[PDB]
């Protein structure tokens, strides 16, 4: 029942000397809604959510540099590289004010951009987002040894680069319902060759867990501090048991963040868009008019 197609015409824009791909649908004026994916996905992740929003709002969904249909420049692919390319993507499209719809490393990018551009963010919808994880005990037990191995020298590259563990293992393991072969092939396409998989390994090595790495920890702490003091309208989707945002964390955010609406989506691990896209898309569409 969940759609497997990707019925969006490609759009491309030159960013810092590379081509970046993005979805661009909906009315051409008004406030645009910017959808940001994370690891190891692309705009494909938003395919069943955008159609709920496009009747009323411009929907823009870029593929991060090195991901989806975007180019693959010779970068480190550290978080700062993604910050630079997304910053330049937003300026290249001439976006002024935006609504953010963000997930995983797309949420680190979105929140970090919002903190630096607070007058330009009219609302933030988010789910399974990057926050400072205090201990490995807060990481789900069934994935703890794997993510520690991703962050272990040599071992992590063997798993993610050589064996494609993030696409073949983590992605289907972090969806409650079974992903279909058609969906897996969409997610596999940008990473068929090992030489393309550096972003997939860099991302877990940047996750802020138990204080490390210190630079990302401080950056994420900073935008969470901004979020806790910001009056911007906020919409959180959460599932059970979750991965980055377990129920107790969703509850804590419901108590501490200003101007927050929360929506429980039912069963969900990390890629909540793949378990209940209809609820996520319909609730975003209902929330946008209040902005
Ligand atoms: Kr993930
Ligand atoms: Kr990264
Ligand atoms: Kr981007
Ligand atoms: Kr952003
Ligand atoms: Kr995290
Ligand atoms: Kr976690
Ligand atoms: Kr896993
Ligand atoms: Kr690589
Ligand atoms: Kr994750
Ligand atoms: Kr709680
Ligand atoms: Kr909640
Ligand atoms: Kr709280």
Residue numbers in the entry: 3 to 293
What does the publication say?
Haloalkane dehalogenases (HLDs; EC 3.8.1.5) are α/β-hydrolases that catalyze the hydrolytic cleavage of the carbon–halogen bond in diverse halogenated aliphatic hydrocarbons via SN2 nucleophilic substitution. Structurally, HLDs consist of a canonical α/β-hydrolase fold, which is composed of a central eight-stranded β-sheet domain surrounded by several α-helices (i.e. αβα sandwich architecture). In all HLDs, the active site is positioned in a hydrophobic pocket buried between the α/β-fold core and the cap domain, and this catalytic center is connected with the bulk solvent via a main tunnel and a slot tunnel. After several iteration cycles, we obtained an 11-point DhaA mutant, hereafter referred to as DhaA115, with outstanding thermostability (Tm = 73.5 °C) and thermophilicity, as demonstrated by a substantial shift in the optimal catalytic temperature (Topt = 65 °C).
Here, we report X-ray structures of DhaA115 at 1.55 Å and 1.6 Å resolutions and their molecular dynamics trajectories, which unravel the intricate network of interactions that reinforce the αβα-sandwich architecture. Unexpectedly, mutations toward bulky aromatic amino acids at the protein surface triggered long-distance (∼27 Å) backbone changes due to cooperative effects. These cooperative interactions produced an unprecedented double-lock system that: (i) induced backbone changes, (ii) closed the molecular gates to the active site, (iii) reduced the volumes of the main and slot access tunnels, and (iv) occluded the active site. Despite these spatial restrictions, experimental tracing of the access tunnels using krypton derivative crystals demonstrates that transport of ligands is still effective. Interestingly, despite the active site occlusion, experimental mapping of the enzyme tunnels by krypton derivatization of the DhaA115 crystals, supported by protein dynamics simulations, showed that ligand molecules can still be transported through the enzyme tunnels. Experimental tracking of the tunnels by krypton-derivatization of DhaA115 crystals, supported by protein simulations, revealed that ligands can still be transported through the tunnels as they can open to a significant extent. We expect that this tunnel opening will be even more pronounced at higher temperatures, which would explain the shift in the temperature optimum to a higher range.
